[PDB]
Amino acid sequence: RKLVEQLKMEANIDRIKVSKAAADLMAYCEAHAKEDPLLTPVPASENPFR
Amino acid sequence: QRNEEKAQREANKKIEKQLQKDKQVYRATHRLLLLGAGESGKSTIVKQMRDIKNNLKEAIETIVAAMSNLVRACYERSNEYQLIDCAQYFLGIFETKFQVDKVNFHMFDVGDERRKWIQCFNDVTAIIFVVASSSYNMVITNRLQEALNLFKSIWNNRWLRTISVILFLNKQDLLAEKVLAGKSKIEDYFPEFARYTTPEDATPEPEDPRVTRAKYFIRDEFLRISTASGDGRHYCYPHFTCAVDTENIRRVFNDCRDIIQRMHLRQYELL
């Protein structure tokens, strides 16, 4: 019933190729990797938990 | 700020005292889950363990609507039909807290097909699975077969690997009435009943042999699933409770005591 209309509405969506999305996501990850306390361990004195 | 730390410590101490009291209360009281097919008369056991007129008339309206979908002349035909309906003789989780002698208990009454919330209940001492023993003839796979499949699904669950099952069979009078009449014989729907025979060891109430054979066949069919799985941390206690039986609460008390005893005996490498 309404599922056909829902799929028809969802069909008309612009798509970005996987290469561009992956490149953008990798660029974001590289840019914001510096401010990641889990990725790079924080100094003990500045660490709130120790 | 030392004052802030002192205030936080005082609040922590007060909350810890309240939490210790709550933990003692929680450990004091056991927990049971009441799982039923809905048409198995789980409400009768709930009443047995522990506006109104309009609601009863409203239930008659659902039966009346079902009869028309499937008045005095057609009323007789409606009863012979096999469909989901309330009792014709008359015409949202629920928590029940009861205390057996010197002990605290607390019942869980869940209100579907996926049953993804079953993993939530793992601290309960037992599952009070209630199934109508006279529902073999009604069909939707027969309803009794569906209940057996649900029992198998509950029994062989990874999360429920240490939870026993208390099994009740209501409609014993109904089962006897349907067996003695001869309409909808067990062999018609359950082919194994022809080969099945009454077990050598049995304690039947002063009942016709056919009723005893049918009841014990249903009990054995339910017990086969329980016995197939691995022994230990799993035990099923079948019961043959009637529609009006006031001894059900003592039966569940004894069953829970045996559950705790057998858990402790399996521990310590005794049993």
């Binding site: 970005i16 996501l25 914001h32 889990l38 | 309240q18 939490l19 996926r114």
Partner: protein, 330 residues
């Protein structure tokens, strides 16, 4: 009848296949690996009576709220290992809890169909949201007055606390919705149902913009990349998958032959490099989002884990298992 829907689904699959040019691993294979990661238990939070089913960090990245089957919703101060508020609950069972970004309100709803929020500023209920059917799975706060709740009836709903009624209803899931996540801009949110399908909804429009059904088992967790254009779903099947919103299809699959247990919670890191995912095998795994290679295993829980959470500042990740004891893992 259904032939048109089948043709539309086939066309959607063909379009998604046509969009794929180079896989994520094909492009990210040249980036340096994150390397071995060792995380120690910075703090342990004991005293909580029963198995925790969910938790949520505070917007200040310091306070957190945890709920268990014991009916206790205790708010913890993670820095000092101190519990500030203990909130008794009318319903014994709680499947989720939420902490508002303002911090004034804490949401808590479970197997009871009614969802209730608490006004921290003793503690008392504000408006027990009851216009719902079935149990709840997860709740989040868009603001101090609008809360979106999951459902056991496959109907995610949006609430207005002052009005107390569902502003809008979301439908389209075959199975019950088990988890959901909100965007940094709060414009859109996704929800992973039990029908192995993850759907993205538009808050204003009220209709699902896309639909992702790459899994095979019930989906039990979902969270966003910090970018907001990609969400990762953790299913009952051992595989954890990362989807995309612009590409409108799956990008990477996380799975190992050694692991066969389910997944109960998935949470990204501050930079999104590490995808921390819990498991039913008493341990929490840390995956590399890009290379799809495991970079360490977190443990220390007697029973299965159920929830995860990373502070807004990214200082540490918290885990609450069925062993009735949370842990903070810096």
């Amino acid at each position: 009848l259904r032939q048109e829907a089948e043709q539309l689904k086939n066309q959607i699959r063909d379009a998604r296949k046509a969009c794929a040019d180079a896989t994520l691993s094909q492009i990210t294979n040249n980036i340096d690996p994150v390397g071995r990661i060792q995380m120690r238990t910075r703090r342990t939070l004991r005293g909580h009576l029963a198995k925790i089913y969910a938790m949520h960090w505070g917007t200040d990245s310091r306070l957190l709220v945890s709920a268990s089957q014991d009916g206790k919703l205790i708010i913890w101060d993670s820095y000092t290992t101190n519990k500030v508020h203990a909130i008794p609950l009318r319903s014994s069972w709680v499947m989720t809890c939420a902490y508002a970004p303002s911090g004034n309100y804490v949401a808590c709803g479970g197997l009871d169909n009614i969802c209730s929020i608490y006004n921290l500023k003793n503690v008392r209920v504000s408006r027990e949201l009851a216009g719902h059917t079935g149990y709840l799975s997860c709740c989040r706060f868009l603001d101090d007055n609008q809360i979106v709740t999951s459902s056991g009836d496959t109907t995610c709903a949006l609430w207005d606390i002052e009005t107390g009624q569902q502003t809008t209803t979301f439908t389209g899931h075959t199975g019950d919705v088990m988890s959901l996540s909100l965007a940094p801009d709060t414009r859109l949110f996704v929800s992973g149902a039990c029908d192995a399908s993850a759907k993205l909804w538009d808050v204003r429009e009220g209709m699902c913009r896309q639909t992702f059904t790459g899994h095979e088992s019930d989906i039990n967790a979902i969270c966003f990349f910090p970018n907001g254009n990609a969400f990762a779903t953790g299913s009952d099947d051992a595989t954890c998958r990362l989807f995309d919103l612009r590409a409108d299809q799956e990008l990477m699959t996380y799975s190992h032959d050694n692991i066969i247990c389910g997944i109960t919670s998935v949470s990204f890191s501050k930079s999104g490099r590490l995808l921390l995912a819990g498991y039913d095998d008493f341990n929490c795994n840390v995956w590399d989002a890009l290379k799809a290679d495991r970079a360490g295993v977190l443990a220390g829980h007697d029973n299965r884990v159920s929830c995860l959470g990373v502070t807004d500042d990214g200082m540490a990740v918290a885990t609450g298992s069925w062993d009735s004891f949370l842990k903070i893992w810096n």
